Design a protein around this ligand. Structure first.
Ligand SMILES: O=C([C@@H](Cc1cccc(C(F)(F)F)c1)NS(=O)(=O)c1cc(F)c2c(c1)CCNC2)N1CCCC1
Ligand SMILES: C[S@@+](CC[C@H](N)C(=O)[O-])C[C@H]1O[C@@H](n2cnc3c(N)ncnc32)[C@H](O)[C@@H]1O
Length: 247
């Protein structure tokens, strides 16, 4: 027989369980939420040891048939630490590679932005927000110039993409940190359980999005340090809010 285990995010693990009911063997796969792109190979108790890029070609009565992509890119469970963002910082995520790219943002003086490579519908995972894992306290206690890329993961953990990893030449394993802010966003941040990055967030569309459209998310500045005017967000956001409210 064959078991499929679906995560809430749409991704799944599929294969024959061993003598103990564990996802362990040489023919197990993680399948991305597109139900087509796969990481196929050696898993131990659901943990990816050596997954090669594959395509889910067909399914017959729950039994999947995969074809390996040409090449030598192998992926493994490689969860970040407080200091290490990735063992392979320049190894892109293959699902992300087909959906998004980094270019100059169409927003003025907003650096780079994240763009859809293709047309997709609502609720589509486009990009992964991986980074080093730090506490809320450390973020709260340090210089604000250090907190451009600090995304809250849960009540306890923040994912950061600090220097020098905020530059694509130094880090391109995930690209979620390139999406800029909008008050009319076309995406949201959502939870994701990634076979390489582990528990992280992703960028998921809210509506249909056309090819080459900039992907944008509403940032969260409710908990910015209070000033005379309320929570004092970074000044670009303050300006854009005043600008947006005028409409
Ligand atoms: O939407 C956000 C962050 C912005 C932010 C970063 C750092 C501090 C704060 C803020 F001060 F808490 F408002 C906001 N908002 S957050 O909900 O993820 C966030 C991020 C955080 F780092 C912290 C908090 C909240 C709460 C206070 N402790 C730190 N981002 C950052 C990367 C791209 C999008
Ligand atoms: C998560 S990064 C987004 C990618 C970033 N633009 C880059 O080039 O690396 C967040 C930073 O992008 C910039 N930014 C995001 N949205 C913006 C906006 N609407 N207007 C101006 N700057 C923005 C701010 O510098 C912010 O600190």
């Amino acid at each position: 027989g064959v078991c499929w285990i679906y995560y809430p995010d749409g991704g799944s693990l599929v294969g024959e369980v061993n003598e103990d009911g564990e996802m362990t063997g040489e023919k197990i796969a993680y399948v991305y939420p597109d139900e087509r792109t796969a990481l196929y190979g050696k898993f131990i108790d659901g943990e990816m040891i050596e997954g090669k890029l594959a395509t889910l070609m067909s399914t017959e009565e729950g039994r999947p048939h995969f074809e390996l992509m040409p090449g030598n890119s192998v992926y493994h469970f490689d969860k970040s630490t407080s200091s290490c963002i990735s063992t392979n910082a320049l190894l892109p995520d293959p699902y992300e590679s087909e959906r998004v790219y980094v270019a100059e943002s169409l927003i003025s003086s907003a650096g780079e932005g994240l763009f859809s490579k293709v047309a997709v519908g609502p609720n589509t995972v486009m990009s992964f927000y991986n980074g080093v894992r730090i506490t809320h306290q450390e973020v709260d206690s340090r210089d604000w110039a250090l907190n451009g890329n600090t995304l809250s993961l849960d009540e306890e953990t923040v994912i950061d993409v600090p220097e020098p990893y905020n530059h694509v030449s130094k880090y391109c394993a995930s690209l979620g940190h390139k999406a800029n802010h909008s008050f009319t966003p076309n995406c949201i941040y959502d939870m994701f359980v990634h076979p390489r990055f582990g528990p992280i967030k992703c960028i998921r569309t809210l509506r249909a999005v056309e090819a080459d459209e900039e992907l944008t998310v509403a940032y969260g500045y409710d908990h910015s340090p209070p000033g005379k005017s309320g929570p004092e967000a970074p000044e670009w956001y303050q300006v854009e809010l005043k600008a947006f409210q005028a409409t």
